[PDB]
Design a protein around this ligand. Structure first.
Ligand SMILES: *[C@@H]1O[C@H](CO)[C@@H](O[C@@H]2O[C@H](CO)[C@@H](O[C@@H]3O[C@H](CO)[C@@H](O)[C@H](O)[C@@H]3O)[C@H](O)[C@H]2NC(C)=O)[C@H](O)[C@H]1NC(C)=O
Ligand SMILES: *[C@@H]1O[C@H](CO)[C@@H](O[C@@H]2O[C@H](CO)[C@@H](O)[C@H](O)[C@H]2NC(C)=O)[C@H](O)[C@H]1NC(C)=O
Ligand SMILES: *[C@@H]1O[C@H](CO)[C@@H](O)[C@H](O)[C@H]1NC(C)=O
Lengths: 118, 132, 118
């Protein structure tokens, strides 16, 4: 509920992206765990990259996550985007089964190919 | 589920309320009240380590959750007076069932260092106990 | 035929059962009481006479009768009845709806839903 970021995010294939999420700068909130997770269907809200050193197998070589405590912000970079990465995601702090999150929507569109006569 | 009356974090209990202006009989309406209890299955009785086994009994008194004893400010005539807000707050002393994200909880353990012993201090909730 | 009042079933001494017959055109009607399927002697209950019921347009008549029976018999579940006899009926038949017997509902739900809180 005190967590805020960009609600909708658009890009095309091959491009990069940069997402920023905001939190109150209290000292519990700076030292706690930050996470980026993909809220799929069928129950879970599986984590993709975290603040403690976890990077998933699908995000290897593509992503990182940086915590800036004096801003109260943390940034997520994701390179080499595809069309299977369209879905609903979440920022957050702490444990996933609580609700200190914020919903983000990401749509990736198909680029140009073999129609370039304009 | 509209207006919060009680948000207690020593017992982890939350009470909300809402006037549901119902459809049928449109000149009368109901008052709904929602209560939410989250019960921890691995906490101790006192919050220290070896106390007593895990708590298995949890008691909630709504006359204590709705209590209000901090002084307030009231403008009567052209004045500011201070008043109380409750009849029963003759006295912390309450027992807590859960932790709280914004408070430290520490302990003291004696360990040996070759010669004498010390009074080494140990953090029980490590996120909230950085000196900052 | 009416259930007993609640306050007479708190001293647990005796209970009262009231049989009301209402809205009939000729002014002659019998009332007989019976325990289970055996009848009672007519010196064990009180029955009134008939009167002109107040009504708009056309006239009716009403009659009443009561019975005081032991409280523990009604607490056990013995059945009482009422036999209202009349000339303008098919066979002058009875009605026996009283015995000693809140709405509870028990549900089990899987609730692997889309996304909600508690
Ligand atoms: C719940 O557990 C806590 C933690 O054990 C209890 O608080 C602690 O109680 C002990 C004994 O009363 C205190 O020890 C005392 O230390 C002073 C020196 O500071 C010494 O003069 C005394 O002789 C004794 O050794 C301790 O200070 C105290 N507080 C802590 C550790 O913060 C608490 O009483 C327990 N509560 C219930 C309701 O069981
Ligand atoms: C607070 O956020 C700002 C963004 O507006 C950060 O500024 C950028 O920081 C990066 C370092 O990772 C630099 O490469 C950029 O040049 C900075 N400016 C811009 C316009 O992007 C700033 O670093 C954050 N605060 C702290 C203390 O790091
Ligand atoms: C890792 O973070 C740095 C920020 O210093 C960023 O420039 C870089 O693109 C990131 N690496 C990726 C997204 O592979």
């Amino acid at each position: 509920s005190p967590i805020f970021g960009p609600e909708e995010v658009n890009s095309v294939e091959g491009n990069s992206v940069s997402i920023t999420c905001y939190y109150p700068p209290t000292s519990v909130n700076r030292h706690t765990r930050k996470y980026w997770c993909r809220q799929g269907a069928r129950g879970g809200c599986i984590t993709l990259i975290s603040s403690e050193g976890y990077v998933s197998s699908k995000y290897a070589g593509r992503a990182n996550l940086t915590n800036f405590p004096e801003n109260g912000t943390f940034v997520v970079n994701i390179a080499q985007l595809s069309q299977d990465d369209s879905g609903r995601y979440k920022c957050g702090l702490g444990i996933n089964s609580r609700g200190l999150s914020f919903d983000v929507s990401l749509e990736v569109s198909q680029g140009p190919g073999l129609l370039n006569d304009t | 589920e509209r207006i919060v009356l009680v948000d207690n974090k020593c017992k982890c209990a939350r009470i909300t309320s809402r006037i549901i202006r119902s459809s049928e009989d449109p000149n009368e309406d109901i008052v709904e009240r929602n209560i939410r209890i989250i019960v921890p299955l691995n906490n101790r009785e006192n919050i220290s380590d070896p106390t007593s086994p895990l708590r298995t009994r949890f008691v909630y008194h709504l006359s204590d959750l709705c209590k209000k004893c901090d002084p307030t400010e009231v403008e009567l005539d052209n004045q500011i007076v201070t008043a109380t807000q409750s009849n029963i707050c003759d006295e912390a002393t309450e027992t807590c069932y859960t932790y709280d994200r914004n408070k430290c909880y520490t302990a003291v353990v004696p360990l040996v260092y070759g010669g004498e012993t010390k009074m080494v201090e140990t953090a029980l909730t490590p996120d909230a106990c950085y000196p900052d | 035929l009416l259930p007993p009042p609640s306050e007479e079933l708190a001293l647990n001494e005796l209970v009262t059962l009231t049989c009301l017959a209402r809205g009939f055109s000729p002014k002659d009607v019998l009332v007989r009481w019976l325990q289970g399927s055996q009848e009672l002697p007519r010196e064990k209950y009180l029955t009134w006479a008939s009167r002109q019921e107040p009504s708009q347009g056309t006239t009716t008549y009403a009659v009443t009768s009561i019975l005081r029976v032991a409280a523990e018999d009604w607490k056990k579940g013995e059945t009482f009845s009422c036999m209202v006899g009349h000339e303008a009926l098919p066979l002058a038949f009875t009605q026996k709806t009283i015995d000693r017997l809140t709405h509870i509902n028990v549900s089990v739900v899987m609730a692997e839903a889309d996304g909600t809180c508690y």
